[PDB]
């Protein structure tokens, strides 16, 4: 019980901290361009496709972290 | 040790599962419009400001989950 769980928590907390940093950077780029478009200023979409790909991967990786944490209590 | 930790894991796994579902829905809207704009088809930005606000809150909430998990091993 105690041994198996803490390892799961450490590894996933680290993965989560990394994924949050990645989401933050990529979404900063996306939110800035969307602010411009909604401001009627047009938008520079340079690099945005790549940021979107990165966020899609991060969401899936976050889902894996959630699954790992939940599984650690069950089996 | 064992008692304090599992509660942290359960509550945060639940919060994480909820936040991932929220991020997924909001980002589906954002990625669809960005795909359109990069496709040269223009973009319908209806509702997008609100999705951006929601993702900003979810990122901050994810950071709180990461902090809680890490703190549970230390103090």
Swiss-Prot record, chains A, B:
Glycans are attached at residues 49, 70. Residues 6-37, 51-75 form a coiled coil. Residues 44-75 are annotated as: Heptad repeat 2. Acts as a viral fusion peptide which is unmasked following S2 cleavage occurring upon virus endocytosis. This is Spike protein S2'. The gene is S.
């Amino acid at each position: 019980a105690l041994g198996k769980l803490q390892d799961v928590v450490n590894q996933n907390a680290q993965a989560l901290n990394t994924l949050v940093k990645q989401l933050s950077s990529n979404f900063g780029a996306i939110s800035s361009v969307l602010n411009d478009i909604s401001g009627g200023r047009g938008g520079d979409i340079s690099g945005i496709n790549a940021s979107v790909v990165n966020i899609q991967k991060e969401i899936d990786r976050l889902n894996e972290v959630a699954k790992n944490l939940n599984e650690s209590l069950i089996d």
